[PDB]
Every structure is written in structure tokens, then in C-alpha cells.
């Protein structure tokens, strides 16, 4: 997995 367990992955394509 690349989409790390941030609360808000700002500036990523993980939305």
C-alpha cells in the first residue's frame, strides 16, 4: 500500500 494512514493525505491521489 502507498496510501499511508494519514488522517488527511494532502496533495496526494489517495482520495
Amino acid at each position: 500500500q502507498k496510501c499511508v494512514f494519514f488522517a488527511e493525505d494532502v496533495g496526494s491521489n489517495c482520495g
Partner: antibody, heavy 119, light 114 residues
Framework: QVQLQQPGAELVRPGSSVKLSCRAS????????VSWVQQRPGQGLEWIGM????????RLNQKFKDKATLTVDKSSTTVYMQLSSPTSEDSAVYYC????????????WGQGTLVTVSA | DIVMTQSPSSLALSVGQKVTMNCKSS????????????LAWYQQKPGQSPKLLIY???TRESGVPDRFMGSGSGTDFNLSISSVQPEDLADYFC?????????FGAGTRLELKR
């Protein structure tokens, strides 16, 4: 257990690029991000960026966007960070670190490489 | 970017004392989804690399003595030690793991009183 092998020190000449090494073991290298962290002498920690060895995708802290370049070598499970046009301001300890799984805090660190900038 | 402010910058203490460190963030680190605060704490002994103590504000990493205590919520957080041991004399840094870029505080240093 997880291991991150860094050299203790590195000498770099001003304006001359340096390639820092961090060899990873003890986990699936192609599944997790490897971060780089700067610690100026006496100062705190500052996140530079990370690279994913799956395909070598990298995400940088915009403050180091034009400063650092991250590369991977999957044959030797090693991650590299390069500093362009380095000055004495870049003399610091550089750590590579690994997230706690997919949780964005650092459960594993390398010993840190002390980079001395001098011609 | 989220800015982290630690205080105080240094503390002189005696072995056995309780101690408290403060870490403030420029915005809330509380995720409403799971009601958890996204802050971590690290210990760095001189010449050593950082070592993870606490994550989610109050959860200890395995192998961390329970004299280390993380508390706080939103934008205000503390790290306390119930009985400061000699090996606890080190630097301590907080980090927000809420959103990138990951940011730390400048740190607090514990030192022996005399």
C-alpha cells in the same frame, strides 16, 4: 527484526553531489515507504521526503523539492538520497526511517550518516 | 504545514521526580472518524538515533516502560514521566502524524539537577 544500514559519516565537497545510502532488511522492501530525516547540529528533526521501492515513486517535502533526489536499488534493497549543490548549511546527520507498517510515525531508524561539507 | 511548538526547551530534574513536557500544534490533530489524536513522541539519547515512545498521543510502543505517559487532545499535548530514571536524561521530540509533510517540535532536553 527490521534493519536500516547507514554509513556513520560522509565527506562531500561544496557544489559536488553526494549519494547517501540506506540498506533495508527484515521486511518486504517493495511494500513500505522509506523516509529521510535531517537533523542539523543542535537543531530538531525535519522530514525531507520518502520513496516507495515498488516502482520508485517519491514524495518530497516542498522545502527540499530542489535539494534532494531519492532513488532505489531493488537488487540490493537499498534506498539513496542525493543532495545537489551542497553547502556547509547541509552539514547535518541524515537519518533514513521506516513507518510503523502503514502508520505515518517512525518505528525504525537508521544510525544516521553525519555529512560533513568541506572542500 | 502544521507547526509544532514544544516547551520548555530544557528541564533540570532529580532522579525520581515526575516531569511534564508540552507540545502544541498549529491545528487540531484529532480525527473525528475515530476520535484519536495523531501525535507521536520520540526519545533521542546523545549520539543515538530517535526512539519511538508514544503514538496516537497516548499509546506506548511495545517495550516502552509505563512511567512514560502521553496525554492531551486537539492542539495541546503533554509527555510525563512518573519517576525519571538516569537513562531518561535525553532529548524528547513530538511529531504530528496527522497529514504530510510530517513535522516535529524543536525538542525538550532533560538534564540532571545539582
Amino acid at each position: 527484526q527490521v534493519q536500516l544500514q547507514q554509513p556513520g559519516a560522509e565527506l562531500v565537497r561544496p557544489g559536488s553531489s553526494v549519494k547517501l545510502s540506506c540498506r533495508a532488511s527484515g521486511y518486504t522492501f517493495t511494500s513500505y515507504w522509506v523516509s529521510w530525516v535531517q537533523q542539523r547540529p543542535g537543531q530538531g528533526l525535519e522530514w525531507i521526503g520518502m520513496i516507495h521501492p515498488s516502482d520508485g515513486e517519491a514524495r518530497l517535502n516542498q522545502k527540499f523539492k530542489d535539494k534532494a533526489t531519492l532513488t532505489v536499488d531493488k537488487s540490493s534493497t537499498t534506498v539513496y538520497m542525493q543532495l545537489s549543490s551542497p553547502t556547509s548549511e547541509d552539514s547535518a546527520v541524515y537519518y533514513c526511517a521506516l513507518f510503523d507498517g502503514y502508520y505515518p510515525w517512525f518505528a525504525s531508524w537508521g544510525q544516521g550518516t553525519l555529512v560533513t561539507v568541506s572542500a | 504545514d502544521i507547526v509544532m511548538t514544544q516547551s520548555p526547551s530544557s528541564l533540570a530534574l532529580s532522579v525520581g521526580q515526575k516531569v511534564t513536557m508540552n507540545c502544541k500544534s498549529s491545528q487540531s490533530l484529532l480525527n473525528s472518524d475515530n476520535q484519536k489524536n495523531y501525535l507521536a513522541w520520540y526519545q533521542q539519547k546523545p549520539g543515538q538515533s530517535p526512539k519511538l515512545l508514544i503514538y496516537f498521543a497516548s499509546t506506548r510502543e511495545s517495550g516502552v516502560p509505563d512511567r512514560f505517559m502521553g496525554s492531551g487532545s486537539g492542539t495541546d499535548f503533554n509527555l510525563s514521566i512518573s519517576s525519571v530514571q538516569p537513562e531518561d536524561l535525553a532529548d524528547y521530540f513530538c511529531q504530528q502524524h496527522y497529514s504530510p509533510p510530517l513535522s516535529f517540535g524543536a525538542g525538550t532536553r532533560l538534564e540532571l539537577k545539582r
